Ligand binder design. Structure first.
Ligand SMILES: Nc1nc2c(ncn2[C@@H]2O[C@H](COP(=O)(O)OP(=O)(O)O)[C@@H](O)[C@H]2O)c(=O)[nH]1
Ligand SMILES: [Mg+2]
Lengths: 180, 187
């Protein structure tokens, strides 16, 4: 509103041429830046979403989802986050052959079966590259309080301008008093 | 200290010449590149010392396809039209504003009216008069700035250099804010 656109390659170339040186140169340068691519073839796929990672300095262990693997098993596990702690969500992906415009990372969070949040993040236009991309979201905080602690379930969607489903997956986030 | 600027707006509204003037202190009278690339501007803006990277973009149609790659990580947008082109100004709310809100949701915008030297230029006034137009007025640029949520509206002339220095100082302020713003956140 926005737108768308686209275209381419051529354209660138053309531118460158224109022429040269011149312017162209420048343109180329630018382209370169864007660049480259790878492849061519376509178938392959042009975009391969490889992983999700919660960048959290306070966390005693790893917090990464290998998205090239089995996605269902994630529903039987969870990520534990202590209440109030800051963290960013890193989406690791590869743009292999063509330039992708208006990339968007969407999260709709659920508590006890019902959807309680919807958040869209603007990733941008990305040209092909041999090297993987890592998109960081702005600094977010884990929720705090009696009514905020508990088990959550996030339905993530990495998409774009043409509304292509580069990858869709479900992961859980359990907010606690302490890491334990 | 390290900040990213992206400059956007209609073809031929004077973006590249503005960046060249800011950078080299002289208007390019003969050759002008489609995009002026890789330049980091040293700006002192009261208190710090900023390194402001200047990312130029273009259209002319297909440069359309690359522009998106310019927006990751910007700290401040200069969104331009030219004061000799009422058409360029309507593109602000019609094209450039949705594009930049899409790619840079919460980055501050400075709306800039370029070619301010043409506002009383005789050939410009003649050419526009024949279309029952006239140069953009400052009030219009300020109200467009208001409408689109800009951090502010400024005018300059790359040709005479009037107002250029202040454009980049305000963009730098804006960027420092952003951071612061951032913280814040938302978701
Ligand atoms: N009168 C006048 N012309 C200018 C000014 N700045 C640029 N120009 C001219 O406008 C045309 C377009 O300039 P350019 O910077 O390439 O615009 P771009 O397509 O937005 O980068 C060229 O012919 C420039 O000489 C200015 O401040 N005053
Ligand atoms: Mg140009």
């Amino acid at each position: 509103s926005v737108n768308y656109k686209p275209p381419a390659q051529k354209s660138i170339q053309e531118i460158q041429e224109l022429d040269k040186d011149d312017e162209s140169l420048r343109k180329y340068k630018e382209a370169l830046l864007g660049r480259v691519a790878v492849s061519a073839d376509p178938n392959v796929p042009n975009v391969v979403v490889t992983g999700l990672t919660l960048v959290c300095s306070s966390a005693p262990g790893p917090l990464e989802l290998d998205l090239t693997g089995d996605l269902e098993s994630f529903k039987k596990q969870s990520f534990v986050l202590k209440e109030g702690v800051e963290y960013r969500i890193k989406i690791s992906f590869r743009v292999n052959r063509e330039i992708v415009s208006g990339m968007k990372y969407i999260q709709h969070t659920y508590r006890k079966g019902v959807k309680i949040d919807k958040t869209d993040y603007m990733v941008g236009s990305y040209g092909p590259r041999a090297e993987e991309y890592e998109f960081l979201t702005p600094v977010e905080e884990a929720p705090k309080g009696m009514l905020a602690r508990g088990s959550y379930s996030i339905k993530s969607r990495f998409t774009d301008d043409d509304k292509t489903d580069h990858l869709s997956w479900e992961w859980n986030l359990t907010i606690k008093k302490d890491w334990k | 200290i390290r900040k990213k600027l992206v400059i956007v707006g209609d073809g031929a509204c004077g973006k590249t010449c503005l960046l060249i003037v800011n950078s080299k202190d002289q208007f390019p009278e003969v050759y002008v590149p489609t995009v002026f690339e890789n330049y980091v501007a040293d700006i002192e803006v009261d208190g710090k010392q900023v390194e402001l990277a200047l990312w130029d973009t273009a259209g002319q149609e297909d440069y359309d396809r690359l522009r998106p790659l310019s927006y990751p990580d910007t700290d401040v947008i200069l969104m331009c039209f030219s004061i000799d082109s009422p058409d360029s100004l309507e593109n602000i709310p019609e094209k450039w504003t949705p594009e930049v809100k899409h790619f840079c949701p919460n980055v501050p915008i400075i709306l800039v009216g370029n070619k301010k030297d043409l506002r009383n230029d005789e050939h410009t006034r003649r050419e526009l008069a024949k279309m029952k137009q006239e140069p953009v007025k400052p009030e219009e640029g300020r109200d467009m700035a208001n409408r689109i949520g800009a951090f502010g509206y400024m005018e300059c002339s790359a040709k005479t250099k009037d107002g250029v220095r202040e454009v980049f100082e305000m963009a730098t302020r804006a960027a420092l804010q952003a951071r612061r713003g951032k913280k814040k956140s938302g978701c």
